Design brief:
part of a larger assembly; 10 chains; A mainly alpha (49); B alpha+beta (290); C mainly beta (87); D mainly alpha (190); E mainly beta (204); F mainly alpha (51); G mainly alpha (94); H mainly alpha (122); I alpha+beta (139); D: 190 residues; mainly alpha; Ribosomal Protein S7; two-stranded antiparallel ribbon; 2 strands; 46% helix; 7% strand; globular; E: 204 residues; mainly beta; four-stranded antiparallel β-sheet; 0% helix; 48% strand; binds magnesium ion; RNA-binding; Small ribosomal subunit protein uS7 (chain D); phosphoprotein (chain D); Ribosomal_uS7_CS (chain D); Ribosomal_uS7_dom (chain D); Ribosomal_uS7 (chain D)
RNA sequence: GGCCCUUGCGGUGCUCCUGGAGCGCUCCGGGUUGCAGGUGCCCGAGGCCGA
RNA sequence: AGCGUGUAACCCCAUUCGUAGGAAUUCCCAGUAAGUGCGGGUCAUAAGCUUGCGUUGAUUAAGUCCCUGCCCUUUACACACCGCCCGU
């Protein structure tokens, strides 16, 4: 895991503007739906074959 | 030595897997041989590759060992050398368990009994292999009566598990005397199935080659998967009339497990045969007789 | 005494000094058992090599000049200032 | 360096006055140890226990007598306390006292036995030095154990008194009485 | 305390080289690998000489008187040794490999055959010098490596066999009638060549 | 059972080049994360970017 | 129904003598018959060229095979046999 | 094979031949003479020390295995073997191991957390 | 330049001790505690045997830390003694001349061999051997 | 010469009393031969086909013992019976060597599991002892008195143990002393090879005060056992026609592509007679036969004590006592000189002359002193002779009988 | 310990005699070189594998 | 301390208090006798019982056939030694 990082070595995280967070959340929601649809369609192809 | 022992085990397991294949190859060879000796059709299965089997027939001779048997590999030194038997008990034995283990030393010729203290089971097997111990016996007790017996063949031989039913020891019977200690004659009766032949082989190889004039007899009789152990000495008072006097312990055996490995290999060894009591037809089935 | 491999001092002979005058010659026997030294004062001393304890002292008629030891035979050669050789 | 038992009892001044028992009492420079606890295997071979230091032998023989077996550190502390009490009372080396007690407690001849159902007959025979040492240690330990039983007195003081009396040669000790009776029976049976 | 000296080399009687009998003929000189042993058949004795060499002995030459001997290894190092005192007298280094060494029966000269040539040297004298042997003459006859040497009884001429299927006879001194002569008639390597008792008549 | 049988014929003298750079931890083969190996000049640039 | 003794290829010097005495039935006559039989068995080997030829080529192969193993092979047990010694001084054996 | 099957000479010779081949490892089992016909030149190569090192998992690469013996890191018993052309017997196969005071053995012990400076370097 | 350090193992039954010896001033610690604080103190002299055999002069130039795990009290104590002795011998071999190592090793062996060589106990009994002597049994 | 053995001879020995020699071979046989009738009267073989590596016999001679390459067990037979008494098991790995105690009749055997085991033959309870070692053991030898034991180990250490007490008396380091040279075909250097080589031959002197060690070298090392130092190094051979003689190979023979030893190898193998076979270490069919490597195969010291022998690749080497090697006087003084010796001879003061000549260790002076004494005065001189000089006079007499005309 | 235009630091380019393996050279001498029988050698891939 | 993935006691330092099982009989040789704790219930057996694993660790003995018994024998010619079991 090696999660630990020294205080001097660590850097502050990026702070996002609300605009791109709306875009980034939209893509992940679209990606979640698309991934589910392809996996469901795979089983239908597997069953019929 | 440890590397040598591991190498011999892999050699033994490798030969065991291919034993069935050689038997089928051997069987096909004899069918071709009969077809050649008596002028007949080659069987349709043997029609192809017939020349190769014919070439093999010329190469076969008495010099070759023949088809291998896993039983023969386990008991390699059965006839040539006398077996060496060691008897031990579970940790903290009872008073009567030590008395039973003392009698089993007398029954088996050349057997030795050693105290079980704080010895690890794996350490015990290592010492037995180093000093050439052939067979190891472990006996269990319940409330002062023997209840279980384990027979292990040290050179990666089979391990057989038994349960004792009706144990009567010499120490309970007063004024018996001393035993004959001669090399005994063995009587095997009631074993007809393939498994019964397998079990009787393990019990018989515990004993050395006797003399022709020996008067000591040990009997193993099978009846409904229960093996009865009897020890007798006989005197010929006259021709055709013989008298029998019972000596030594008397107990019953019921086998329930055979494993390929030694008793230090519980987690790795395969099970050749196991008793299944929850089978739907387990009540009406026997395995030691046909 | 110094170690050849590491160069570490391994002790000295005598409480403060081995001899009053200059040390003319030193020698160690083949078995590393006895050590012999000479001084300009004219004394011949024998020392144990291990524990560095004095064994015996021999007075010389003249001051020693050079000294060599034949280890195998155990024979010691001394050349003195009076032109004589003592064995 | 100098090796002293328990860090305070020297072994160089200890000397043995019996020529026969010099080879069977291990107290000298090679057998000098800081503690009577070495975890050695002295019962593996015949005659090897003669190489065991006599303090360790006394510790081992004091574990079998009147105790739950296997408690060796307690016996070591008992021996240490007994040696301290001996030094306080007498003012000399307790190792010398132990050696003198073992020398005095050892019988010189015993009676070998010829026994039937009716009566027993006797014959005086000699005793080997190893059996002398073993029997002297056994008698001293048994005397200390029987003295300490059912009395308001810890085992250390009884053991110290037993060694003091045996080394002195007085008749107040159990081991001296046992030795005298055994040699008397052997003398009467010559 | 531990004062020991080498005495004899048992277990070996011949490795490589040429065998020789002593002058009287009772003892035999045999090279055993690095060393040389004398076997006295007269007294039933074996004696390994104390001398040692860097390489295996290839050539052993004996002086006619029986006092001196020359022992040469494979590498070309040569030792002049006295058989009477069993001590190595002197050292020498021939530049190249020598096939054989032979003394003249008179005992004043000896021939060393090396490479394609044969070099004739004087016998060692009583005078002691840094260089053991003074080179006298050189002969450069054969095509290929020379093998064997033989001397006439009068020590006037000598003969050398060679690998070039021919034998060359040379003169110890420059004779007007005979400087050198060559003999053929063979289709393989010459192994040995000999002379008569009192003639130049020869065998190949 | 398959894992335990493989331990029987394990050779203690077996050698792999992966063994040189990796050390066991309690018998478990943990792959430690690779280092970054930053330099002081690089380190000073990160702190200026952060402020 | 006992353990049956298997057949040994090795024959010790104590059972070899036993075999000869059993069939024949003084010591020299027993050895005399065996010596004649052993020579007769030896002779028949040489008159069969095929056994002779194959014996020599077996020897060549076994010598080569032993060196490759650096003389680490399973040994052959010694056969008990009879040898003829003559009544003459021991100097000749030197 | 051409000899009669019921011949004492054939039986003794056949048993003698197969036990030598089995000892060197050229033949898998001491069966009939049919197995004696399967030996090739490659059978001898499989018994060499570098390829036996490969099977024992001491080395994973054949050029690496040849390197180890040539650099004196493998021993057969107390003796150290440098010649790659060295046919190892089945019995001798049990006793091929890293020579002591070798760097490769140090790496093996370091990985297993069994590195002892006293025992190894001594 | 680089630090001079040696790590050594000591074993006794199921007790295992790891000892690290480096250049230092004479500090010897076991599990972060001094030598005198290790229990039981009845065998405390058992824990002090090497230093008393060698003196404070030889231990004055090294720091040793011991980490012991497993087993009981006595096995742990013996493991710590073995680890200390072996670590000191290894350090004097690697970073000091061989003569001091040889003499110290000879002293330690002459006192007690278990300080440097661990001898685990196996099962050897008369029951393994047959009745009677090795010779004269069955003729 | 005896030719009953078909394969190579691994070990030989003599019985303590009789003129009987016992031999073990790779045939699987141990054979006994007598020097009275020159016959092989007894042969011992194992019930299981095994090959033997070494042999040891008791001082009584009733017991014969041998060890195996593969079965890893010791076989013990009776000499008079000829049957197998027992098989000793417990070792792991091949057995390095066996030896019987000269005075106690117990067996010491070394194995490659870092152990030396002691076996008691005439013990009712079958006592056995184990001596653990840090490294692989190669040789075991007893001192002639039997009170000390020596083990050579693979780390080149010779450890001296007390057998009855099972305690290690001492140790000797000898890796540096066994100087080893590189063979012509070796890619590694001499030091790297030497890091993996140890002593393979050990031998006590008759007095036991010194030990001899040998192995993969041209040097035999003589050590003082009590002081644990090397007294002397003997150079067995200086022949440079044998491989590995020198530590550093000549830079002259190098070219760009190496030393090219295979060409000289084939030039050597032009001897013919057989065909070289790949991988054979020794023999005619071995590739490296023309230039065999230098080895001290075995060392032994005479019971008489005036010589010692070694079997090496060169052959059998014998080294004998010689007065010329070292001057070893006993008790010198300025009065002790041959002039005073001949003076005391002239005044017929035989005892003082003989004593002072014995204080010198020159054999000719004591020879002249003893031969000067007329008969009838012998007993006076013997009575006047002190106890210490008796052994010196006996040693001189024993030396004298060999080369003196005046036997009686 | 010594060092004073220095360094617990690093690198280069030439020279440094072949055991057999650069033989043959003081003088003298080098001119007229004065068909036995041979028949060789080479040709096997099957993994108790590792990755 | 050491075995045991199915949704520590014992010991140790100090404080206080204060005067057990006949006659017979069985078993046991080294990490053995004896003490102490901690787990599992594994296709048989096992519940106040069965079996693992660790901790501490001894006294005596290493040889005779006297008693009580058992197994065998009294028909490979080195040297040396030895020189016929008996009865119905
Ligand atoms: Mg118990
Ligand atoms: Mg317990
Ligand atoms: Mg009670
Ligand atoms: Mg419990």
């Amino acid at each position: 895991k090696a999660g630990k990082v020294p205080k001097d070595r660590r850097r502050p995280a990026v702070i996002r503007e609300p605009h791109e967070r709306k875009i980034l959340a939209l893509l992940d929601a679209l990606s979640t739906v698309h991934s589910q649809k392809m996996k469901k369609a795979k089983e239908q192809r597997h069953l019929h074959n | 030595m440890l590397r040598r022992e591991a190498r011999l085990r892999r050699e033994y397991l490798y030969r065991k897997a291919r034993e069935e294949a050689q038997r089928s190859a051997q069987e096909r060879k004899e069918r071709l041989r009969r077809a050649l000796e008596e002028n007949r059709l080659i069987p349709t299965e043997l029609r192809r590759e017939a020349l190769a089997l014919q070439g093999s027939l010329e190469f076969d001779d008495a010099g070759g060992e023949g088809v291998t048997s896993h039983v023969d590999d386990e008991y390699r030194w059965a006839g040539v050398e006398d077996p060496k038997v060691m008897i031990t008990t579970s940790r903290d034995p009872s008073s009567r368990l030590k008395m039973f283990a003392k009698e089993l030393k007398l029954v088996f010729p050349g057997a030795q009994r050693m105290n079980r203290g704080r010895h690890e089971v794996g350490a015990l097997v290592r010492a037995c292999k180093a000093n050439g111990v052939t067979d190891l016996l472990v006996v269990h007790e319940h409330r002062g009566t023997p209840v279980g017996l384990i027979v292990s063949h040290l050179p990666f031989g089979p391990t057989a598990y038994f349960t004792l039913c009706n144990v009567v020891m010499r120490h309970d019977i007063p004024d018996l005397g001393t035993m004959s200690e001669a090399k005994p004659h063995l009587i095997t009766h009631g074993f007809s199935s393939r498994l019964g032949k397998r079990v009787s082989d393990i019990l018989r190889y515990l004993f050395p080659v006797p003399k022709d004039d020996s008067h000591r007899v040990i009997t193993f009789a099978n009846q409904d998967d229960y093996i009865s152990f009897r020890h007798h000495v006989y005197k010929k008072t006259d021709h055709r009339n013989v008298e029998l006097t019972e000596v030594g312990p008397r107990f019953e055996l019921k086998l329930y497990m055979i494993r390929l490995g030694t008793l230090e290999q519980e987690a790795t060894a395969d099970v050749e045969w196991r008793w299944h009591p929850y089978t739907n037809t387990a009540r009406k089935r026997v395995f030691l007789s046909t | 005494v110094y170690n050849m491999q590491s160069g570490i001092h391994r002790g000295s002979f005598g409480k403060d000094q081995a001899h009053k005058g200059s040390v003319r010659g030193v020698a160690v026997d083949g078995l590393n058992q006895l050590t012999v030294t000479t001084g300009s004062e004219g004394l011949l001393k024998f020392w144990n090599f291990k524990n560095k304890i004095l064994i015996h002292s021999v007075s010389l008629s003249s001051s020693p000049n050079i000294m060599l030891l034949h280890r195998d035979s155990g024979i010691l050669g001394l050349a003195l200032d009076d032109f004589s050789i003592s064995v | 360096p100098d090796i002293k038992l328990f860090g305070k009892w020297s072994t160089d001044d200890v000397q043995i006055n019996d020529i026969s028992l010099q080879d069977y009492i291990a107290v000298k420079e090679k057998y000098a140890k800081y503690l009577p606890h070495s975890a050695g295997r002295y019962a593996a071979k015949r005659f090897r226990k003669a190489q065991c230091p006599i303090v360790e032998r006394l510790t081992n023989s004091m574990m079998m007598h009147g105790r739950n077996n296997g408690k060796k550190l307690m016996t070591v502390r008992i021996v240490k306390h007994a040696f301290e009490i001996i030094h306080l009372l007498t003012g000399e080396n307790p190792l010398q006292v132990l050696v003198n007690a073992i020398i005095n407690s050892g019988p010189r001849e015993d009676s070998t036995r010829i026994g039937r159902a009716g009566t027993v007959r006797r014959q005086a025979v000699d005793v080997s030095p190893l059996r002398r040492v073993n029997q002297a240690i056994w008698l001293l330990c048994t005397g200390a154990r029987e003295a300490a039983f059912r009395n308001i007195k810890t085992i250390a003081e009884c053991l110290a008194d037993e060694l003091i009396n045996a080394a002195k040669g007085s008749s107040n000790s159990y081991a001296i009485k046992k030795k005298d009776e055994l040699e008397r029976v052997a003398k009467s049976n010559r | 305390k531990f004062a020991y000296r080498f005495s004899n080399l048992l277990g070996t009687v011949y490795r490589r080289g040429n065998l020789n009998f002593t002058c009287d003929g009772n003892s035999v000189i045999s090279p055993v690998g690095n060393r040389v042993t004398v076997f006295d058949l007269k007294n039933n004795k074996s004696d390994t000489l104390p001398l040692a060499t860097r390489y295996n002995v290839k050539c052993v030459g004996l002086s006619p008187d029986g006092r001196l001997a020359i022992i040469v290894d494979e590498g070309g190092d040569a030792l002049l040794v006295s058989l009477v005192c069993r001590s190595v007298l002197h050292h020498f280094h021939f530049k190249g490999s020598v096939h054989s060494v032979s003394f003249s029966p008179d005992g004043r000269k000896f021939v060393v055959t090396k490479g394609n040539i044969a070099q004739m040297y004087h016998a060692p004298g009583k005078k002691r010098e840094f260089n053991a042997f003074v080179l006298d003459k050189t002969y450069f006859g054969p095509y290929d490596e020379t093998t064997c040497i033989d001397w006439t009884d009068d020590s006037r001429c000598f003969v050398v066999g060679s690998k070039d299927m021919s034998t060359w006879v040379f003169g110890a001194e420059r004779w007007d009638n005979l400087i050198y002569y060559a003999l053929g008639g063979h289709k393989d390597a010459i192994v040995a060549c000999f002379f008569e008792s009192n003639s130049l008549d020869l065998y190949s | 059972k398959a894992l335990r049988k493989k331990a029987l014929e394990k050779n203690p003298d077996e050698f792999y080049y992966k063994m040189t750079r990796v050390k066991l931890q309690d018998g478990v083969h943990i792959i430690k994360e690779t280092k970054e190996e930053v330099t002081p000049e690089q380190l000073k640039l990160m702190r200026t970017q952060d402020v | 129904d006992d353990v049956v003794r298997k057949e040994k290829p090795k024959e010790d010097a104590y059972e070899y003598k036993k075999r000869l005495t059993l069939d024949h039935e003084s010591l020299a006559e027993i050895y005399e018959q065996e010596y004649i039989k052993l020579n007769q068995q030896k002779t028949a080997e040489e008159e069969n060229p095929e056994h002779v030829e194959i014996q020599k080529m077996m020897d060549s192969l076994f010598l080569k095979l032993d060196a490759l193993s650096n003389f680490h092979f399973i040994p052959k047990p010694p056969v008990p046999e009879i040898k003829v010694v003559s009544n003459l001084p021991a100097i000749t054996m030197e | 094979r051409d000899l009669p099957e019921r011949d004492q000479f054939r039986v003794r010779a056949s048993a003698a031949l197969l036990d030598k081949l089995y000892a060197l490892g050229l033949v898998p089992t001491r069966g009939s003479l049919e197995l004696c016909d399967f030996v090739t030149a490659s059978s001898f190569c499989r018994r060499r020390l570098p390829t036996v090192l490969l099977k024992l998992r001491m080395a994973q690469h054949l050029q690496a295995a040849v390197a180890f013996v040539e650099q004196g890191h493998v021993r057969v018993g107390p003796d150290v073997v440098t010649d790659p052309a060295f046919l190892v017997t089945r019995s001798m196969e049990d006793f091929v191991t890293w020579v002591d005071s070798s760097k490769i053995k140090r790496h093996v012990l370091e990985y297993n957390e069994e590195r002892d400076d006293f025992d190894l370097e001594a | 330049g680089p630090l001079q350090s040696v790590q050594v193992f000591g074993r006794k039954k199921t007790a295992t001790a790891v000892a690290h010896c480096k250049r230092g001033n004479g500090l010897i610690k076991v599990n972060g505690r001094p030598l005198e604080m290790i229990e039981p103190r009845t065998l405390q002299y058992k824990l002090l045997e090497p230093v008393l055999l060698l003196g404070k002069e030889r231990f004055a130039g090294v720091d040793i830390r011991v980490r012991v795990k497993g087993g009981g009290h006595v096995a742990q104590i013996y493991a710590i003694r073995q680890s200390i002795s072996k670590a000191l011998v290894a350090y004097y071999q690697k970073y000091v001349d061989e003569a001091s190592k040889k003499e110290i090793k000879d002293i330690l062996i002459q006192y007690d061999r278990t300080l440097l060589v661990a001898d685990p106990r196996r099962c050897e009994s008369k029951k393994f051997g047959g009745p009677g002597a090795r010779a004269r049994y069955q003729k | 010469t005896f030719t009953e053995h078909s394969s190579g001879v691994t070990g030989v020995t003599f019985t303590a009393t009789g003129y009987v020699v016992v031999t073990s071979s790779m045939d699987g046989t141990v054979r006994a031969f007598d020097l009275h009738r020159y016959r092989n009267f007894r042969t011992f073989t194992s019930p299981r086909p095994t090959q033997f590596s070494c042999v040891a016999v008791d001082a009584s001679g009733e017991i014969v013992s041998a060890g195996a390459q593969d079965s890893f067990e010791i076989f013990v037979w009776s000499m008079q019976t000829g049957r197998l008494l027992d098989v000793l098991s417990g070792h792991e790995g091949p057995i390095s060597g066996l030896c019987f105690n000269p005075m106690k009749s117990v067996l010491a055997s070394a194995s490659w599991d870092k152990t030396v085991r002691l076996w008691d033959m005439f013990d009712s309870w079958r006592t056995k002892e184990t001596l653990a070692l840090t490294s692989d053991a190669l040789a075991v030898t007893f001192r002639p008195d039997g009170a000390e034991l020596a083990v050579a180990t693979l780390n080149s250490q010779i450890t001296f143990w007390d057998p009855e007490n099972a305690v290690q008396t001492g140790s000797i380091e000898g890796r540096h002393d066994l100087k080893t040279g590189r063979k012509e075909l070796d890619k590694i250097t001499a030091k790297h090879a030497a890091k993996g080589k140890a002593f393979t031959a050990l031998c006590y002197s008759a007095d036991g005060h010194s030990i001899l060690a040998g192995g993969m070298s041209k040097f035999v090392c003589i050590y003082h056992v009590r002081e644990q130092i090397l007294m002397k190094r003997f150079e067995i051979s200086c022949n440079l026609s044998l491989d590995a003689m020198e530590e550093f190979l000549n830079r002259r023979k190098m070219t760009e592509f190496g030393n090219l030893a295979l060409i000289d190898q084939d030039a050597g193998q032009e001897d013919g007679v057989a065909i070289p076979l790949p991988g054979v270490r020794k023999g005619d069919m071995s590739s490296r036969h023309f230039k065999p490597e230098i080895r001290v195969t075995s060392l032994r010291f005479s019971p008489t004590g005036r010589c010692w022998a070694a079997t090496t690749t060169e052959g059998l080497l014998i080294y004998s006592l010689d007065t010329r090697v070292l001057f070893d006087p006993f008790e010198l003084d300025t009065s002790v000189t041959p002039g005073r010796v001949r003076e005391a001879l002239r005044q017929q003061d035989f005892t003082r002359a003989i004593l002072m000549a014995l204080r010198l260790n020159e054999s000719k002076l004591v020879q002249e002193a003893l031969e000067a004494v007329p008969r009838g005065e012998i007993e006076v001189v013997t009575s006047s002779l002190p106890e210490l000089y008796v052994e010196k006079v006996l040693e001189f007499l024993a030396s004298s009988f060999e080369v003196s005309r005046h036997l009686e």
